[model samples]
Target: KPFLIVIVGPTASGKTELSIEVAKKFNGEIISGDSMQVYQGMDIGTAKVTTEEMEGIPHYMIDILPPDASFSAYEFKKRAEKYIKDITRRGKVPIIAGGTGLYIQSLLYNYAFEISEDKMKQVKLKLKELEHLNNNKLHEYLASFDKESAKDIHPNNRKRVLRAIEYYLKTKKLLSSRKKVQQFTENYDTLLIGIEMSRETLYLRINKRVDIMLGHGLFNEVQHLVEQGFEASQSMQAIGYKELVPVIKGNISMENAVEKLKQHSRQYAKRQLTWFKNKMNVHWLNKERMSLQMMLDEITTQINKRS
Candidate 1:
């Protein structure tokens, strides 16, 4: 059986650095599971790993798409699986690392995605109209159509909500049910390691990280993207970037945007934890309680035992 190790956690939980260290020690290459990190030139807001941070370890599934281009969970799974196979064929363990639960789940479970381009286009157009009207109204519509998906997807995440609703409309099946069916597939041996911290600590880390990004010119980064013709809403939708867009446009105070960003980040972290705890078979590691090496050793030991 082919074996892959996955490292998942909420944002600001230090999965990037620890995963790289584990890869180096285990003769592995990382295949990123982040949804936002897939896009190029959106680095700061996504907290994407820099060349220096990679520590000479190879990483994949980053910079694969333009910031303005959209990529789906299906697309991510397809590409990431190829990367995993390619790495495994070279006799290197494939390390999956990131915070995006849906994309990670799609790959681990071999989820089947079936939808047509025309239907997708229609869904996108409808979502755009709804967003133009009011994001809350659109979320209410999603709640009416598929409450499960609406609960998982943030009201501000129009892209994912549209996809979820479209899936139901196209196939006459719930997206959640399709995912459950996919869990029965026999494909790869998966070992999941999840990192976590106390709620207060996590929120503090997120707040500080946002400040650090701003110090590193995150606003300028968004300005460049905006100059390239990306809409403020599109750029801002990428977490940190989205929060700063209003400030950049002088529509709101930076303090207010920062507060909003912190709140959203905390909510996103909670959602991520819920998804992993409820939907996946994950060995949870509280970083506040254990060392990274200990966590890595336990994960490797589990893989060896299973293998």
Candidate 2:
């Protein structure tokens, strides 16, 4: 099996910088695990890595789609496998790096995702009919069919809740059957490096990162996308863009929108950390204490042993 390196962390957790350095050390190319980075013209919001910052190290799974289009974890899983093998075939290591926990988790497991658009359309319409019901009621409906999925997914996680229900209806099987608590495999030698930091530390960085994004014309980026006829589509609903929509609509102040974005980003970071710990067999490192050299040392030592 080929060796794969995964750098997992929250947004603004220094993942991009660290991943690039590790890529330099490992002669590796990056396959982004980020959902947002897959969209073209969505750079500032997604924090897409620039060519210069790449320092000539090749990257993949980024800018492969447009803002108006959408891609799924299933798509990411398939593409990631191909990219990982392609890079390994060429004798280069593959580094999977980003804060998109779902993408990473879906790729790591041999989870099956073969639902079709027709079934999805039917499910969405049915789910819409149930919108009048509360979250508890919606979950109760799913629990009646798939207890495991119901217990596993929170009621307020509407997308997941709906998916669990949709999966149960489509396959007459539990969504958790193939993967829920993780079914480990040796399909590849994946080095899962995860970063964790104190709330105060991580939250401050998130705020600062938002500040940096704004300074880099994040608002203008959204404005440009809007000018290009992008609306409440898949790309516009992203963290940075979503908050600004109301601001653009004259419903909220820019300050309020920015604060909401920062708060939501911090919340998202916390959720990413939690989900990663629960779903991935990751080697967690303390970002507060570990320097770049330390991270590289730990990763190198561990990967050297694995190899």
Candidate 3:
């Protein structure tokens, strides 16, 4: 069987650097398991890994689509699987790395997603109309439709809220049912490594990262995207860029926007941790407790043994 090493963790928990190090050690190519990073021209807001940061490693699944293009968990799984197989055929290990739990779970579960695009489009259109009314009402409607997904998605996250509603509408089946249908052990001999840190430390790192992005001209990046005709509605949905939209429009102070960005990032990190712990069988590594080399060695040993 082909072997895959998955490096997952909350955002800003050092998954990118650690995964690259592991890939270097294992002669592997990296396949990004992130949802937001797949979009083109969304580098800073998504906290995408820089080309220099990739350290000459061949990475797949980044910059795959325009920002307005819709990407789903099913699509990610399909493309990710193809990339994994291609890498393995080239005699290279495939290291799947990122923090998007749904995308990672879909790929790892080998989920079968055969729904038609026209049906999905109809669902999206309905959701768009629903959003025009009230987000909470739409979320309540989704809870009525698919309680399992509702339990996890926040009402404020209208994007995911709509997605859950759409899933059921198009298939005439519960989201959990599709998940059950795809329920099987992964095709690859896989090793899962999750990085973690103390809550305080993690939040601090996230806040600092956001501040650094601002200093590195995050506003300018967003402005360029806006100039290119990307709507504020679309670009602002991304964390860093979204928080700054008010500041850019002169509605809020830059300092206040930065604070909001930090708070949102911390919340997102917490959500990521919750999703990973509950959704997958991951071997956790606390960065505060272990050295990177030690973690890498443990992961490599596990993958070698599994293979």
Question: How does each model score on TM-score?
Answer: 0.74, 0.76, 0.74
Worst 10 residues of 3 by lDDT: 176-185
Residue-level error in angstroms, candidate 2, position 269: 0.6
Alpha-carbon runs more than 4 Å astray in model 1 = 111-183, 232-236
How many angstroms is residue 5 displaced in model 2 relative to the true structure, after the best TM-score fit? 0.5
Compare the candidates by TM-score and give the number of the best one.
2
TM-score of 1: 0.74
List the RMSD of every prediction in angstroms.
12.2, 10.6, 12.0
Residues 1-307 of candidate 2: C-alpha lDDT, one tens digit per residue: 6788888888757777789989999899998888889899999898888888889988888889988887888888889899998998999998988846667766776654334447556766886787888989999998898888789789999877876776666556757764543455435667888888998999999999999999999988888899888886987987889898788779999998898999999988887876665445578889899987788888888877876
Q: What is the lDDT for 173 in model 1? A: 66
Candidate that would win on lDDT: 2
The local distance difference test score of model 2 is 0.81
Q: Which scores greater on TM-score, model 1 or model 2?
A: 2
Model 1: colliding residue pairs = 236-242
Question: Which has the better TM-score: candidate 2, or candidate 3?
Answer: 2
Which residue pairs come into collision in candidate 3?
none
TM-score of candidate 3 against the unseen true structure: 0.74
